[PDB]
């Protein structure tokens, strides 16, 4: 049945949502992508409230204090993808066209789930068939890369997936697309520092820039509103509801116009004052990024409180699905990242600082209300990424990959940016052994073949 195959395909999309629905405990992909970076404090009630997040933040995670749930989510996704791909040959009434569409969606989701494992843990069990015989060989991070990027190249070269819309059907928005595939491709090539693939990744970014179907939202602020969901900037979103606005809002808040007294806020991800202060007064991203609460407004201050929070995913009564869940879609890939990806890839393949790289970076700066740069360097692109993507889980991975980027300044590299602060919160400096977080002791106990990452 095409009906049953479609059910199995929906099942393969489902784990994308599991972090924000609460697999054992509440979690969010942007929290996981931000806590090891320099934009936020972890917060919560105290330093033992999500102790694993506090320990990751300080490069002191261990096999009992890591992101084990993300491993379970990703391998659950992978198992459902592998199952869908098994079922596709046992499909009788499914057309060749729909089979290829179902196949390429499952394979791209599978790359997506492996990409998350690779980013966080690096050295992971790698299988493209479920094990009914029952564990897979642990690959090195570099082996996982070689496999994943080969698999993604096969998916992209098929030219099966539609660029932006399934046939144009607004009610299938959330499916993976060729445009989403291009963004994963660019992301992985850049994270690996795989120079052999920079020109191809640039080519894919220029197809999206040359396309009539994508543009920057004229208002950065409007991106984050419910009406901004699936605007023409949006390449891929995860549809919701989500607990995220509960996690990253102030506790016992007396209420404002958009959010009533008596709603839960757990006080995670206080925004650092340094993050507010890096924006110019003219930068339109500052007020869309930073929810500043006046010092005179009394809420219950939690650990590392700054009276600044992330505006992009702040709770509003109108967005409710105690009431812990909200309707905010998670914006995963935006066309702002297409332009900044392209500008960087152009500069790192010999491109002119006054050529296409300047046009693309300046389109992002202009949307934000800033003056264009007359000449663009790779360090300018990394700085623009920091301003553009606060609270979107980009900054930490950008700081780590920048270890391999020749013209990166100290403020844009993990080893020099991720250092102790004046408040005594972060007391360790990031080093290369912190690049792959600990595997959870439970996984080691299930699989005696697994080797722990040398993180300690």
CATH for 405: 1.25.40.390
Three-class HEC string of 378-426: HHHHHHHHHHHCCCCCCHHHHHHHHHHCCCCCHHHCHHHHCCCCCCCCC
* Selection from 49, 70, 60, 180 nearest residue 120 by Cα: 70
Report the alpha-carbon distance of residue 289 to residue 172 in Å, rounded: 29
Is 390 a domain residue?
yes
Q: Are 226 and 186 in contact (CB under 8 A)?
A: no
Q: Are 72 and 108 in contact (CB under 8 A)?
A: no
Q: Are residues 109 and 10 in the same domain?
A: yes
Q: What is the DSSP letter of 192?
A: H
Residue indicated by tokens 């897979």: 136
Count structural domains, the chain: 3
Residues 6+ apart with CB under 8 A from 437: 56, 61, 66, 67, 120, 121, 453, 455
DSSP string, 93-118: SS-HHHHHHHHHHHHHHHHHHHHHHH
Report the alpha-carbon distance of residue 73 to residue 194 in Å, rounded: 27
Task: Locate 260 and state its tokens.
Answer: 């009533």
Is 153 a domain residue?
no
Q: Are residues 9 and 99 in the same domain?
A: yes
Report the alpha-carbon distance of residue 442 to residue 190 in Å, rounded: 32
Is 132 a domain residue?
no
Strand-pairing partners, residue 308, are 292
Angle at 329 between CA 286 and CA 245, to 5 degrees: 65
Residue 334 main-chain phi, psi, to 5 deg: -115, 155
Tell which of 142, 170, 202 closes a domain: 142
Question: 350: left (phi > 0), else alpha (psi -120 to 50), else beta?
Answer: left
395-413 as b/e, with b when 16 or more CB fall inside 10 Å? Answer: bbbbbbbbbebeebbeebb
Q: Are residues 316 and 285 in the same domain?
A: yes
Q: What is the DSSP letter of 7?
A: H
Report the alpha-carbon distance of residue 380 to residue 387 in Å, rounded: 11
Q: How far is CA 79 from CA 149, 183, 188, 232, 401, in A?
A: 19, 23, 22, 33, 29
How was this structure determined? It was done by X-ray
Is 102 a domain residue?
yes
* Selection from 275, 251, 273 nearest residue 391 by Cα: 275
Q: Are 268 and 248 in contact (CB under 8 A)?
A: yes
Report the alpha-carbon distance of residue 310 to residue 266 in Å, rounded: 13
Q: Are 66 and 52 in contact (CB under 8 A)?
A: yes
Angle at 115 between CA 420 and CA 76, to 5 degrees: 110
Q: Are residues 336 and 321 in the same domain?
A: no
Q: Are 148 and 114 in contact (CB under 8 A)?
A: yes
> Could you tell me the residue range of the domain that residue 50 belongs to?
40-66+241-328
Report the alpha-carbon distance of residue 337 to residue 331 in Å, rounded: 11
* Selection from 203, 212, 235 nearest residue 346 by Cα: 203
Q: Are residues 318 and 217 in the same domain?
A: no
Report the alpha-carbon distance of residue 53 to residue 48 in Å, rounded: 9
* Selection from 288, 297, 296 nearest residue 250 by Cα: 297
Report the alpha-carbon distance of residue 130 to residue 110 in Å, rounded: 12
Q: Are residues 55 and 87 in the same domain?
A: no
Query: Alpha helix locations (H) across 41-158?
Result: 51-57, 68-87, 96-120, 141-157
Start-to-end C-alpha separation, the chain: 51
Is 181 a domain residue?
yes
Task: Locate 308 and state its tokens.
Answer: 């600044």
Q: Are residues 358 and 415 in the same domain?
A: yes
Report the alpha-carbon distance of residue 394 to residue 402 in Å, rounded: 12
Residues 6+ apart with CB under 8 A from 158: 100, 104
Is 455 a domain residue?
no
- Largest CA-CA distance found in the chain, in angstroms, rounded: 67
Query: What is residue 360's three-state secondary structure?
Result: helix
* Selection from 289, 312, 251 nearest residue 28 by Cα: 312
Q: Are 132 and 159 in contact (CB under 8 A)?
A: no
Task: Locate 321 and state its tokens.
Answer: 């699905």
Q: Are residues 228 and 303 in the same domain?
A: no
Query: What is residue 13's three-state secondary structure?
Result: helix
* Selection from 60, 62, 69, 61 nearest residue 27 by Cα: 69
Q: What is the DSSP letter of 281?
A: T
Strand-pairing partners, residue 237, are 331
**PDB resolution in Å:** 1.9
* Selection from 217, 182, 191, 239 nearest residue 367 by Cα: 217
Q: How far is CA 434 from CA 11, 87, 315, 418, 430, in A?
A: 34, 40, 33, 11, 6
Residues 6+ apart with CB under 8 A from 337: 183, 235, 385, 388, 389, 394
Q: How many CB atoms lie within 10 A of CB 287?
A: 13
Q: Give Cα 28 distance to the centre of its chain.
A: 10
Q: Are residues 22 and 107 in the same domain?
A: yes
Q: Are residues 217 and 181 in the same domain?
A: yes
Q: Are 149 and 197 in contact (CB under 8 A)?
A: yes
Q: Are 345 and 186 in contact (CB under 8 A)?
A: yes
Residue indicated by tokens 């391999």: 404
Q: Are 63 and 439 in contact (CB under 8 A)?
A: yes
Report the alpha-carbon distance of residue 280 to residue 274 in Å, rounded: 12
Q: Are 44 and 265 in contact (CB under 8 A)?
A: no
């Amino acid at each position: 049945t095409d009906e049953h195959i479609q059910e199995a395909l929906i099942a393969a999309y489902d784990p994308l949502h599991w972090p924000d629905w609460g697999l054992g405990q509440y979690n969010a992909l942007n929290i996981d992508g931000e806590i090891m970076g320099d934009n936020f404090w972890v917060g919560g009630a105290t330093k033992t409230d999500m102790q694993n997040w506090h320990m990751l933040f300080n490069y002191e995670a261990n096999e009992n204090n890591t992101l084990g749930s993300l491993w379970t989510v990703d391998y659950s996704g992978i198992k459902r993808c592998n199952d869908l791909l098994k079922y596709l040959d046992w499909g009788t009434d499914v057309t060749e066209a729909n089979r290829k569409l179902y196949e390429m969606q499952a394979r791209l989701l599978r790359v997506f789930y492996y990409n998350m494992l690779w980013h966080y843990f690096g050295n992971v069990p790698f299988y493209l068939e479920n094990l009914s015989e029952y564990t897979a060989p642990q690959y090195t991070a570099d082996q996982v890369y070689a496999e994943l990027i080969a698999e993604l190249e096969a998916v992209i070269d098929s030219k099966v997936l539609p660029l932006k819309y399934y046939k144009d059907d607004e009610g299938q928005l959330g499916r993976v697309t060729q445009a989403m595939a291009y963004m994963v491709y660019a992301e992985m090539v850049m994270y690996q520092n795989d120079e052999s693939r920079f020109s191809k990744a640039l080519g894919y970014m220029k197809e999206l820039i040359d396309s009539p179907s994508f543009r920057l939202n004229p208002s950065f602020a409007n991106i984050w509103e419910t009406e901004g969901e699936w605007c023409d900037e949006s390449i891929w979103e995860i549809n919701y509801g989500t607990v995220l606005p509960t996690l990253i809002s102030p506790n016992s808040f007396p209420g404002d116009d958009g959010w009533s007294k008596g709603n839960d806020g757990w006080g995670f991800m206080p925004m650092r004052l340094e993050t507010y202060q890096m924006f110019s007064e003219q930068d339109k991203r500052r007020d869309a990024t930073c929810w500043v609460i006046a010092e005179d407004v009394e809420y219950t201050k939690r650990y590392q409180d700054t009276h600044i929070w992330l505006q992009k995913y702040r709770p509003y009564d109108k967005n409710f699905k105690q009431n812990l869940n909200y309707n905010n879609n998670y914006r995963y890939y935006r066309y702002a990242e297409t332009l900044l990806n392209a500008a960087e890839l152009s500069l790192r393949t010999g491109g002119s600082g006054t050529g296409e790289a300047k046009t693309w970076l300046n389109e992002v700066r202009t949307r934000a209300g800033l003056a264009g740069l007359a000449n663009v360097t790779v360090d300018d692109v990394l700085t623009e990424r920091r301003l553009e993507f606060v609270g979107e889980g980009k900054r930490y991975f950008d700081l780590v990959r920048a270890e391999g980027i020749s013209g990166a300044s100290a403020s844009n590299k993990a080893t020099t940016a991720l250092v102790p602060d004046e408040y005594g919160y972060r007391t360790n400096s990031w080093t290369a052994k912190k690049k792959y977080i600990p595997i959870a002791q439970g996984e080691l106990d299930s699989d005696p073949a697994l080797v722990q990452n040398a993180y300690k």
